[model samples]
Every structure is written in structure tokens, then in C-alpha cells.
Target: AQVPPALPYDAALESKVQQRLARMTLDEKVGQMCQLTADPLTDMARTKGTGRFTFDPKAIERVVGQYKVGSILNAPLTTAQTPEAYARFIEAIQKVSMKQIGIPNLYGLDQNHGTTYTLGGTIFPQNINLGATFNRELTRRSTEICAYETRACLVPWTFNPTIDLARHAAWPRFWENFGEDTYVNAELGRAAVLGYQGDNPNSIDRYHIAACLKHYMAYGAPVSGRDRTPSSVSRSDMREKHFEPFRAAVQSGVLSIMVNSGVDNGMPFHANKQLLTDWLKRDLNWDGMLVTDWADIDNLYKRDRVANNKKEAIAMAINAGIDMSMDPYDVGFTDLLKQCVNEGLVPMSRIDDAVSRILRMKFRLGLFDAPTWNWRRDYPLFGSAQHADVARQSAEESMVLLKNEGQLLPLRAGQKILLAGPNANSLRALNGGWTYTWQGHRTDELAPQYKTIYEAMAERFGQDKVTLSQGVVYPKADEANSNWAADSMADLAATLRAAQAADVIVACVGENSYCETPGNLTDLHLSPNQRTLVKELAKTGKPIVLVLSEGRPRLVGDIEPLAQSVVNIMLPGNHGGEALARLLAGDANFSGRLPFTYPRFANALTTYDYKPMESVGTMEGNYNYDAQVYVQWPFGAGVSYTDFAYSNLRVSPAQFAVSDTLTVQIDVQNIGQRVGKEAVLLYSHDLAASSTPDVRRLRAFDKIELQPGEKRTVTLRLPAADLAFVGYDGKWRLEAGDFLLFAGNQQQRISCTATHLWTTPNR
Candidate 1:
């Protein structure tokens, strides 16, 4: 709906980049496009007892000096380093680059939340939790801390703010992205870009770093709900739904973008020139760097079978518009790309275009002037209490109360509480993946300062009043080779015995920490043992509270009715335990809502924005459009401690042209006894359309805090053009139609008079 402003141009930087390009040889240009990991460069054998890694001078000489690699990513041995250690590690590789090539190297890591790759750094709620908060300012604040602390480690780049929409429920990496809404993803993605890169893109300040929009273009909707699998998406859906967020971020001046590792409609994304080139680079006139996901270039040949050999794979991806290859371990990309350039398999102009973009990013970061900073002197607030407080608040606001029957929550002070389940005592469960280690198995050892759900509950309820009867126990940290494996029911009989003495039982269960492929599952049901534990605990007749700490929603339909209260705290990082304790003790109110639709059955997955035709007729009528939607909880469903009522819905300029702007307002009052926060969401329903429309679409939302009996009018402005949809012809159109707008319990109707069509991607 909004046109992206053109990226700022700098003539001086252009001249400098071209001047450097003129002096570089063909081998050097090819090397500039290669990115290697830190594994081969670190000597693990010699650094056994040193607490930190030792860089092998010969390895650095071979990779950075002899091979002339321009970029490096990941930590040595795939483990997080201390802020001081990160600085030293980055400095070590940079020293060799400056001496041998005179071109500074770019370093990157997956700092998804708040400096996740740096120990002792503030870890905030993951992106999935942030999506539940529905607070744009919170999303921006968390990433700002992520950028500040990441730069404190002297690393200039971070492959973060995964903008892929979480459409498939069983997708293992669902927790890594925002929920399933285009507007939400676009809005939050823009905020993350601004937070990481700052307001100025041309000259990134010292406190900020560059942000890369990751796994671009429909990566979350694999057909089998598996990671790195094929996604079957319609062209219109691709343009309207999946591409919208990335387009908005690129408009906001995101420095770089990572290509998806999965295939789309039988074509590997690594080899889709129409998308990587025509759609992104040409359509938007974007000049940002385009980097491939980990070894995806090799996947095109070896796995996807699109290319004949490794050399062909290199040529195909480079020709398809890849600027850099994230060839983590091998330095062979240097020579392969060199052969492509010399043989005309890849053009010289394309090589220059790719190298110029890489150089532009380094120049924009001011890395050419000073590649490394004085970490100790410049970043005294690397890990501060002030930053951790925001993380606590973020986690607190993200806890959604999906079920609170009979007013069972807010347990009284003196009530004896029984904390039982695998997730109750483990830090690994609270912080899902991408923590101090990749699988997050090392979280307990690395984050000894934080409290678990059991520990925090005990502190809040008094040590004597809280009983710890963990009937279910996760595998030992060393045994966690897979995250989808079920935990064993150690002693359900003993847990029931403990539940008899306690006034209430808090069952913490859901999932363990896992990332990517290892997190994949065949069944979305709650683990058999955990479900059995809840069923047995319910028999004790002590009001049971279910705390689901998971990356994605696992089915709990069978046991959901048995619980008096249910909470879904989706991966709230280190401070999550304390936040959960506060919410249950009435120290804080539940404010978050589900970002995506929760399914009752594993096979009945559907998004909130399902097509109208999906649920039209009944099976009894022989049509079975009986698509009867069985939903456990709809999107934007959550209950706060304080009750909120909506009234006095109003819309101005009710009948207007397609180009006109309409204003809508509704009065919201806190009717309950306590002060609470409410995420006021505005949804729009198109009465009719040439193409099938969604049941309802999220338009605009705002979060506000209200005192008891306090009433406030929430006003939202909607651009008429935003109501337009991409048609079957792959163009945008806004047909004359009546629309119903909803907020809380109130509804208002508006009409558009004239139809409008646009040939451009951005309206």
C-alpha cells in the first residue's frame, strides 16, 4: 500500500568502491564473494584447557592470506564466545586480512534474539514471543539491544530478524520467525530493520550494526512441514503474502538478504533467477548484498539435483544472482568461482556487481576506516541490568492465557503448589534454540544466573509452600541428540501422591529445545508421557494449571479440558521463568495473544486468514465443504486479568473512493478490578471480491495499559489502497466493495466507491 522510498545514494562511496575494484585482479574479486566459517581457522587440540580458542596462524595464512576470503561466519566449534573472546577472535582474522589483502573482512553470526551468540549478554524473548506481544516498540527495543551488544563484540554483521512468515504449524523453524500475518510480519520486520541498522542506512553508527533479512521467500511453508523441503505456493500468494514482508524490510534499508534453502514449486530457490534477480533486484531496484544460506549452493547440485556437478552448481547459483556463498568449511569456492569468471560461465559485469555490493556494505559500516573497535573501553554496558529489565518485561507481556476457567489463576500466597513436568526445572526448555549453543543443550551450564520455572515459582510462593515432584524428566544434556524425542514418565504414581497434598498443581510440559531439522516431528500431539501425567494429576481433583513452554503449539486437546488454567509461553528466553512466576502470582497481568491459529488436531492445521470457500458447505449436504474448522484457539485469542469491553464504534468518510483514507475509532474500557494491558487489534472483512478473500485480515493493532474502569478511544487510520489484493493476473487490484471492520466486540461498516488497478508491485 505504501511506496518504498528510494535508497539513499552516495557518490563518494561509489567512486571509492569502483576505484578499489579497478585495482583488484580476477582472483581477488572471486575471493571477495566467498564466506568461510571459523572451524578450520581455530586449533581445538591446542586450546583444550585454555577456556578460549587459539587461532592457528597457518590456518589463517591459508584461508585469509592464500585463499583471500572476504567474509567469515559462525563461532569456532559452533559454540558462543564471551564478549571479550568474540572481539579477540574477530580481531585475529581481521589482522591477517589487512596485512595480506588490504581489504577488511566482514564477520557475521546468528544473533536472533539479543546477542544470543555472546555469553553473559542479555537474552530477550524470541521472535515468536515478540509476535505475541503485538507491541512494535517492544520488538524494536529488543533488537536495539541485540545490535548494541553484538557490536560490542566488534562483529559488524548479524544474520537476524528472520522475516519468513510461520504458516505451517509443524515446521521445525516456526519459532524463528514472526507469526502468520503479512501486516504483522511487515510491521515488525520494518521495526527490526530500523532497530538493527539505525535510522541512517548510508552511515551506520558505532553503536549499531547491519541486519540481514534471513531465509527469504516462502521458506516456512514446506509441503511436508519439514525444514529445507519443497514449498508449493501460488504465484499470487508468493507476491502478495510471502514477498510483502521482505519488500517492506528492503524499503526500510535492510543491508543484506539471505536466500531460502528450500525449493519452491520444483525449482531450487538457489537457482531461481526470476525471483532472486527479476523480482527482488530489478523490481525494487535494490542494491543490497544477497548471500546464500549455509552451503545451499552445494545443495543445488548434491541434494536438489538441479546442477550436474559442484562446478555447475557454483555457476548456476552465481548466475542466478547470488552475491556471496556461505561455504562454511571449504575454501574451494575461491577457485571454482575464479574458473567461472575466466571461462565466461559467469560474466565479468556480474562479478563486479556482486563484489561492489559486498564492498558497499563494508564501506557503509565504516569498516574501511577502523575494522575493529576497542571493545573494553567502548562497551562498558555489554551486559547490564537495564537491558535485562526490558527482557523481563518482554517475557512478561508475551505470556498468553489461553484458558482460565473458574478464575483458577492468580494463586493465593499461602497455597501449597506442586511443580511437576520436564519443562519445570530445565533452562533448555525455556529458551528454545540458538542460545549459547546451536541446539541450546548447553543453556543450563552457560546461564547459571537465571532461574527455572520451578525455582522462580518457589521464590514467589515461598520455599516451604512449593513442592517439587518432577514425575517427567528430559534426557540428560549429553543424550539430547534430538529435540523431538519424548521424555519418560519417571513416576506418575509419585506425582499423583504429591498432588494430593498440594492445593494446586502446575504442570510445565511441551517441548525441549531444538533447531532446524533435528526439531522435526511426525506427530504434533503432546508427548504421550506428559499427557498421561496430566490425566493422572487431574484425577487428584486439585485444580491443574498447564504451562506450555514450546517453540510451536503441540496438541493438548485431550488434556486441555482437564486443566483449570492454561498458558502458552513460547520460548521466552532466560528471564521467562521469572515472568511466568509473576503472572501466576498476580504481580503482572497476562497481555499477549496467540500470533498464529492453534490447531485442535494435528491434521486440521489452518491459518486465521483461511479462504472463505474453505468452510462453505456441510458434509451432510454431500458437499463436505464441511471443511468444519476445528480450532483449539483462534488467532488473537487471549484473556487478561482485567476485563475489557468495547463500544461506540465509529467510522468517518464511510463511503469513499479507492484512493481515499478512512478513519475508524472504538472506545475500550477496562471493566475488571485490576490494571492490565490489552492488545487492541483491528480486523477487516471484505464482503465480496472477484478473488476469494480471507475470513478476516489483521489491519492495524496497538497495545495500551488501562486502569480499572478507565475508558480510552483507540483510533486507527486505514489507507484504502492497502485493501487491494494481487489478482490471478499477478497484478494488484482494489474492487469497489463494502467492508466490515471489527475491534474487540464492536463492528463498523465502510464502503469504497471506485475500483482501481495498479501495474506496479508497490501501490
Candidate 2:
């Protein structure tokens, strides 16, 4: 049971890998590749002493020494008093496992938003908040920090960078995705992979704990956003739009891939060889271990009735290219795997392939030579000063100033601020999910290191100048005596009176983190109480700055018009409070753009992908709705303290051949005095096709930084693949059409229009 050694290959290494591959027996290979939950093994001894059920020496000997289990998932670690204590625990586990197996066990855990599961790890904003930020670079940096912290714990595989492009807000897991636009999802997903993997694929320092791009394809489009439910997505839709992020992940050289548990077009993703083999393995050229989602193989058997027993399920999964199974507590399934291999239901070649992928990852991680990597030496490095700084910068970059009319932001230093909102003072509300537990706990139960917006504001503004108030009462509360009602109203009114007398008012408001839970909301609107609170605050009319902290996008409805400026914080992590304060204080610039469209009305759910006619003209009479189909704040919209101007647009080869690469260039100038970042958006419109595509879809974008009066030329290179859409036949093909290209700051196309004639290739 030798651990594997780093990636990239020479002939000698490949031959050695093949030699090792050839020597393994089918059963041994199968046993070595399957990952199960450590809960059952650890639970037995946990009932006694041993403090907590961690992967200690006794537990490691049972699994690695006796069974020689290939991988361990969701291994428990103590909530150490400090980061050093946490590091010691991880090191202790690795040291114990090293004595049994020549190679270290592949320790994998969920580190979705920061290494939130770990005791001392830093937490960050959820994907939904990041989507609102639309700062891919920041997301990339944050993920890199997460990877670094995870590696410090001596864990090598992170189940992360979930690339599901969640289109429906109703889905319980919508916060896990990067929102509706495939382009935004794909690009940001790729950025996360790059950040995790770093510049070198094999570098231990920068390389991530193996980045796993998950849910394969179309899990985001689950009907009404139901988790694990069957999706009715079209084959063409899956290829063109839904699966783009997976393609992007493959391109970024992700080390592992997790198949979705949900059904795609009536077929479980685990059984869809067309997707697993043809598209992912063959088309995208993904050369990594393919792992099943939690208990998916058995679930397939139970859900689809493809097999009556676990053995058959194991056989089906192996044949379908599932290299590893995340069974997590099902040792019976491991026995079933052995049975399948003995019966030849699963071929030895498949077993070898699975083991080879696992060994390759271990080797790439440098676990083979240095089997007993010192976690103590590495632990201090996790979430070190440098990592925290990067995280702080990322948090700052992710702050989106949704509105800033009359230049109300960059709050004056001496003005008193009345800080109020459930989230403003709650750290747990800011951290959101995938922290401490699979789903985050309430505000009261959050870790001590966690910081809140109110704390951050008090730190920035003198504590004496900052007045804190919990205006709304919880359902369980006794409203009759709470604040005694009269005092709160009087205090709030007095606070408002102070704001009226003062220079400005910064009012924070939005949903608590729990609002993002699947099936949590009856509709996408603020609570009636929250609405009333905002309405009351709006009466102050002192340049009201509404800071919305939430996990998903919500329709503000009439709430938008009442405020002087609005900022959506989106449940940013431990540094969220300080980040928001910095942005408001003009210490940091607000550069984040929206990754999803903001609805004007709760009834309208139109994405940027909707066709031009869908809003008006030919399709106008098709529906009874009179309001425009556009969003309140379109995708790619965000306000900054500075302004940018686009000029001198040019397109190469004005008339393009089907195979021609279209190069669009535009000069972006910082027209404002302050330094800022701008997302240069490039959109493409197909004038004619069998089925009309969207009026404009983001083709390419570049985030550029500039000083006042500085200008730079930004170019977008679009290959035929960018212009091509999945035809009715489920193949990506560029049809003959007139293509219009526009470059702008927002969705409202500005500064550029170039015509290109694309002709079909002679097949």
C-alpha cells in the first residue's frame, strides 16, 4: 500500500505507473479506490472516552492497517482552541495513518466557502453573495486562501468549486452556484480552479488540496430548484449552456470531478455514460479521477431500480466511469465492490483505471515520498497573515455598491452612524452556510473569531458615535414588553432625528443567512416587517444608505426608490464588516458587478438569455403582462465611486468565416478622479438562426484597473466555439448569420456595434 508520488509525466514515470497498475489485483484495486465515511469506524470507540471521534491512531489502525481503505471522507477533527491546536490534530491523524499504509490516505472534506468545516479556518461569502460581487479575481484569490488553509491541515482533497450554474432561485442549493449566466459561471468557475491549482500544477506551496468541480452537468436547472430532483433539460441546452462550467473546469486542469446525484433529462447523472464518458472524458478531455456524489451509486439503484443490490450498483458505476464512490458509512458497499470484481461484473481493466487515477492524484500531491508530512510544521502556515490579508482584500473587492446617488457614499469621518439590522451585528448571518456544520448554525452559536458588520463599524467609527439597535422582534419574542415598544420607536425616531441633524445616515438591512435555505421562502421578497423597517428609516431622508446583506437576490420593489444609495453585502465572511466599512469610508473602492439580473418585480424572472422579441414586438401579445421583461438592475450592473468611458471600438475581419477568430478591441478610460476597477463586458447578438438565441449573451469580459485619466485597450478573443450554440441535433455549430458585437460597462449596450458574417463549414 505505497502512497503515490507528483503529476506531469516523463516516459519512465508513466512506465512505472503502468507497472504499478499492472501489479494490482482487481479486488485490491477496487478496495484501494473506494472512499467511505469514517463515522461508523470512529463511532464505535467514540461512545467510550478518547475525547472526540477523530481519526486517531486506534481508528487509523483499524481502517488503514486492517482493511487498507483507499480514502476517507468527512474525517472528524476537534474544534481546537487555536489554529495551532487544529493543526496538531490534523498532523496527529496523518502521523498515525502513515505507519499503516506506505502511502497516506486521501483525506477529503467539504471546504466549499473557505475551509468552513475546520475549527480555525476562515469563512467567506457564499456563492450567491460572490455572484452579486461578480469579481472573479477576488473569488480566485479567496479560493486560493481556502486551498492554502486546507492543505495546512494536511488534507489533500477539497470537495469544492461547485460549478453548478444555478438559474432558479428556488433551489435549496442555489447559493452553492455562481448564479444563472453560463458565461459568468464558467469564467468564475475556471478562475477558482486556477486559484486552487495555482500557477504550477505540481507545486506543493501554491497547488490546491485537489480541486473537485462538482455535479457534472445540469444539476443547477433542477425543476423549481429542488435538490436531487430530475431535470427536464434539453440535450442541446445541456451541451451549450448548462455544462459550460464543467468544460471550463476541465480546461483549468481540475484534479477531481464529482458526478451529480440528480437526474438529467430523466437519467441519473451517474448512469449517463453519454455525459460521463462521451462529453466529459472524450469531448472535454478530462484526465482526472471521477468520483460519485454522496451515496449516489446506491441511490441510483434505489431510485432508478437499475440494480436490485449494491453489487450491481457498484458494477454499474465502475462501468460508467465512476472511479471512486463516496459511500460514507456503507462498508457493505465495499464488500459488494469486492463481489462485483470477483464475479467479473466489473472488469479488471476498469478496476486498474480507478486505482491508477487515485494513485496518480496521491503522487501529484507528493504523498508517496513524504508519506508522513508534518502537519505541525504546516499548520501555522494555514490561514497565516498572508492568507488572511488576501482574504481581506477579496472581501473588500466583493463589496458591490448597488446604488450611490448624489454621491452619498464615502461617509464623512465624524458623522454618527445608527447601525441597525439582524445581519449588521450577527456574525453567523454573515458567514452563511458550509461553516461549522454542513449548514451554518444561528448567530448566537458562531465561533469567537467571527466578526460582524456592527463590530467593524464600531471599530471604524468611534464606539461612542455608533448606536446599535435590534429593531425587529423575532417570532418567539414577547413584542409587548420588547424595548417596551414605545422606547424603541422613540429611540429609533431620536436616532432618525440625529441623522437628520447629522451629515449622513448608513442604514443596514437584508435577509438573515437562513433565508437562502431551499424551501425557506414562500416568495422572493423582503419580510413585511423588514419592509416596514425600511419604510420607517426612509422617512429620515438624510441620504439613507441601505446596505443589503443576503445570500440570494431579492426584489426590493418600492424599497429601491426610497434610499439615496443601496449596497448589497451578500453574507461576506469574517472580514465582511470591515470590508463594507472600508468601501463606505472610501478606503476601498466598490468594483463588484452583479453576476445575476435583479428583478424589477417579483413576477418577472427573465434572465439575460431571453431573446429580444421575448420582451416586446412579436412575442409582446403572447403574454398578458404589460410590464417590461427587463430586470431592475440588469446583469453586469454595479456602481462605483469612479466612472469609466469606452471608445474606439474595432473588430478584426469585419466579415468572419465560420472558423475565423473574432477579435474585439475597445479603449476603456477612467473618466473619474478616483482609481477603480471596471468589468469590460463584451456581448454578441445573433441576427438570424433556426431558433433565435438571446438578444445579447456575455461572450467575454476583462476586469481592468486604472488610475484617474488613465486608458488602456482591452481586447477579447472569441473562437468559433464562442459564437457556436448547440444546434437542434445536440452538436455545437456556428450557423450562417449576422453577428453584432457590443462592448460596455452594463447590459445596456454602448460604444460598439460591429457586423460579422459567419458561414457554415463545408462538412
Candidate 3:
């Protein structure tokens, strides 16, 4: 079970909590658990010259004064506004809350990647990019920027550090996860949580904001790879695989959690007592605020059909340990909740528990005592260069060089390079999904300061050298409002003629920014329009470099063979253009490895953690049981400008008891001239088990930077008990048996049949 520090509560605070509960009316108590939606993105949320909704004094004052709303959430929006404008808006809400009820509101934003909702804010690479860094420190550092920037905007809480494992690549929010490893997600998620909430929750101040460790219980691995879809899994597998990171998160002291929006094994997570109540609150002992993911309480009735009505849904969600409702729409949910409590459908004790948890965290955040709307202190901090520099570094490190057969990249200063494709110069593609607007807005909105990929390249390679033909044109502002784009015959033909004269062609293509249902797809292939452009470019005999700015893995099998170089610049944020330009110019080396599998065939949806029986494949020029495991790149597969060699693997005390410890050492030497970094990964397979096991599961890893010929001896320390996994009858255990250990990258077998034994007693 996960363990965390003691809650910041004492006898005096406990007495005060009960005193406040005693004084509060049922309406006041219920109001504390409700969160209203505020639009920091849409014009409807605003009025004229200034922003509106939560920012609008009249509109926000009603929610705070009359309704006594204790919380507000900005659900990932971009309006091309300044950060100070939001800071003042949040402060204004706090002032009204204090005047009306003597309590402050917890303003939350889904600032998933570097305060993404606000413009000119530090837009770092998406979580998918950070996953490739494999650098926990980098994750923490970048998230620290997120926390600091979030506070600078006066938003005290964030629904982020999406600890959801990358289970299904086709899920629209796959790129928002920490790749497909339970351990990496746990480590990085913990880092981000600490970066957000701080180690000492006793005093979460300006530098730290309340962290909402979110999308609990397998949100990414839906049945049909669509958002909010149902999927089933075994009990033991569920414990062993899906919930591990969330367990670690609770253990590491995150202040809050957001339950999954989708169904798992036929039950909606908002109403699942076994997961939200029994396992999380009881077994794991996480006494934190557990909230639903965006109107999920309503989803319990309207969408999932799990409950008969709103009252029933409220009872199930509240009883299942959801402390707060992201009700979203209006006072209707609060009214239904009140009716349920009054009618004895829901108990008052549950309400108290929910209200108290929210109050405790608000108190911990110093909201009640802090000064109101101090704009002067925040003016210089938001969107500062210091934060943008960290963003640039993360962006530079996140880029992966998939194929560079002839050193075709590092474009010469004078080479005539044709920059083509629908996404060639688009800022909307660079900042996917949650940006200025939900689907990202037009270049005109970003016309003043945003630098597109084509613009960045022109600046880097000189305007005289880089030419943009835009081989395929997307929807301009007049055509489709930039929501969707496709090919124009006239544009393609003119661009083709323009491409004929360039020495090299750089095609930047991928899905435009989108989230939820808009990002869902049935096939994981490049758009036919973009694919045709690349094929024709390949035929031109010019060395082609394919740059991908996408949210998920789009199969590049056909293009992989034709392009001389492929760079997976997966959603590098606002500074993405500059970062990609630097990488292409060899100013930065590609250190990012694939966080998830890059399938050669769209139908071949296999991950690194497949079981023994699942590994059976076809042989002798035939197929078997639809088994064709072809991949362009596996997880941890990244090529640097340099090469490295692994040697002298050793595991001390090869045989150990269940209570013992183990130490493994391996030497990795950089074999190429260029200085680079490598992710030294470790994998283990239980040779015999009481239950089925993965072919090889990632056990531990360490990342290191080395110069050419520099050998570093990296040591790994593990407790013998740490190797246990969920076994028969849903109980986790370690069996006495042989285990195969793998060292180095996922593809490299640097160690030869290393052995280890697990035993119940002394060995």
C-alpha cells in the first residue's frame, strides 16, 4: 500500500473544522463541494474590451456571493490574453468569496503543459515530449515552471500531472500521458506533484500550487481507442498494471485526484466503490479530495446508464468517494445533491467528509489569509524569458531522430530547402489541443508574435535559402475556420512546381490541434493528401526529412522508406519552431527515445509488456493467428548523433531471500564522437510464475550523459521484495523461481542470460 506524510491537521485545526461545520448551513456545506465552469477561452464567456465569466465582476460575484461556490475550473482554453489579466480575474473571485462567506475559492486550470490556457505563457513540450526525456529532474524543473506560472496567474490549483499510463496510442489524450511504463509514470508524476504541491503541504505558497493527480483508473486504454469508451481487464492485471502510478501518486502526497471519465470492465469509474472507495481511500489510505473529470457525475446517468437519475448518480458518486462534483452546467447539480441529501438518499456524513476535505486543502493553500489581488507582485513573473528558456530546453531534448541514414539533417546554411505540407508553417499544429482556444486558433489571432515552423527555418537558414510552397493547403480562416484542413488541387500543383527546384525537401505534417472526440480516429495513418505530397517529393530525388507534429503516433511505414530522415517533433510547444530549427541545424542533438511503440502496421497494436503466449509469431513465409509483430521503432528506441556500447554486466548476490536486497551494475561507454545522453533501461521477466507474466517488464532505469569514449558505471539498487506482482486470486506475491534480466536499451541484449532467484524464506 502507498504511504504519505501525515495530513496537516492538529487538535486545534480539527476543532476548528468541526466548529466551522457546526456553524455552516446545509447549503453552505454542499456549496463547498461544487465547482462551476468558467471560460477563460470563449468570447461568450467574455463581453467586450475585457474578459468575462470568472473574470467578469458581475457574473463571478453571483457565483461567489449568492451560490457560495467554493471552486472554479478553467477547462483548458486559449484566448490570446496576457497572464496578468487572469491573475487579476482569479484575485477578484477570491475577494468576493471572502466578502460573502469568509472563505476563498480554489481556482483550478487544466494547465497540463506549462500554463497552456494563457497566451505568451511558457508553453513547454507536451507530456509526451517530457516522457521521451526520461529525465525526472527535467520533468520536475519544467513542472516547477508550470506551478510558478500557474500561481503567477493567481490560479491556485491545477488538474494535471496526468498519471494515466499510456495504454492505448489511439486514445486522443495519449500524448498527454507519461508514455507506457508504470514506473516512469510514477516517478515523473510524483516529480510533477512535488513540483506543484511541494513536499510540505503544511505551507503551500506562491511557488507551489495544489496538484490534482488525475484521470484515475485506466482512462487511456479504452476498448475501441476512442475517448470515454469501455474496456475490460482481469482483476489481478488491473492491480498489477493500471493503478500502480496512481498508487504511487497518493503515496507521494498529491493533494487531490480526478477519477476516470470512461468505463472500466463495464462500470463507470465515478460509481466504482471497489476502485474509488475500497482500494483508494481504504486500502491506500489517501485522505485527499477525489473529484470527477468534467461532468462525469452527469455521465453516470446520461451517458453510462449506470444510474437512473441525477439524484441516484449523485448518491453513487458521493458514496463511491467522489468528494467534489465538476457539475459544470449550473446550480441544477447542486440542487439535485441537496434534494438527495434532504430526502435521505445521501447521508449528511458523506457531505461533511466531502466539504471538510475541500476546506482543509483550501486552508493549507493559505487562501483564507493571503492578500487579495496583488497585481504588482505578479506583473514581472508571468511569461518571463527564464520560464521560456526552460521550455526551450525541454523542447530541444524531446525531439527524436527516427531515421538519419545519410546525415541528411543539419541543413547547410545555403542549401535550398523546400518547406511544404499543410502543417509546414502552422503554430496551431505545434501547440496541439489545449492552447489559446480548445482546437487552437488561427495565425491571425497569433499573427503578432507566434513563429511558425517555416518562419523559424527561414530565420535559421536565411530567407534566401528556405522557400515555402505549402504543397497542400489546409482550411484558411475563410474556408473552415482553421478547425480542419485538406488539399487544394491548385495549391498542390503550384507547390509541386516550387518543390522541383529545391536541393532538399522538409515536409512538416500531422494532425492539427484537437482534444476529446475531435481527436478520435479509426485509422492511424497519415492523411492521404499529405501522404501524396511526400510520395511525390520522394520521387523528386531530393533527400526528404519528415517532421511530425502530432498528438499520437501516426503510422509512417510508407513514408519511412522514402524519407532520408524522420524527426518526431511530437507537439513541441510555442517555441517548437525555434527548437526544431536548432535541431535541424545541429545546434541540439536528438536525445528523445520513443515513449510508446511506433507501429509499422496500424493493426499491429502490440506493447512491450505482452505475455508469454501472446509472443507467438508466424514463420516460414506464412502468418499465424493474425500475429504479425512489425514495428518501425519499439519503446526506448531513439538514435542520437552519437553511439554507445554496453559491457561488463554484473548482479551482486545473484541468489537472495524475499527480505534481501539486490545490486546490479553495468558499464555504458559512448562510442561515437558527439557527446550525447542515453537512457540505461532495465527489464526483468519471471521465468516461472503462479500466473501469466509479461515477456519482459521494465523494472528500473537511470539516464546518463557521456562524452565520446567516456565510460560510466551505473549501479541499480533494488529490494528483493520490490519485484512482487499481482498473482492468483488478485493477490500480489513473489514466487521462488528463475528470472531473466535485460540491460541497456530495449532492443539491446547487452547481458547474456543473467539469473536471479526469488524465494519465500532464506535461500
The 0-to-1 C-alpha lDDT of every candidate, in the order given, reads 0.88, 0.69, 0.77
lDDT (tens digit, per residue) of candidate 3 on 220-301: 8887889888867677657777788887777777888999998887889999988898878777756678889888888999
Residue 271, candidate 1: alpha-carbon lDDT: 95
Best candidate according to lDDT: 1
Q: Write the per-residue lDDT of candidate 1 for residues 56-77, one digit (tens) a residue.
A: 8899889989999999888667
| Poorest 10 consecutive residues by lDDT, candidate 3 | 746-755
In model 1, where do residues sit more than 4 Å from their true spots?
A: 1-6, 49-51, 477-480, 616-629
Report the error of model 1 at residue 527, Å.
0.7
Model 1 pairs in collision: none
Top-down TM-score ranking: 1, 3, 2
Higher-TM-score candidate of 1 and 3: 1
Question: What is candidate 3's TM-score against the reference?
Answer: 0.92
Which wins on TM-score, candidate 2 or candidate 3? 3
Reference-based TM-score of each model: 0.97, 0.88, 0.92
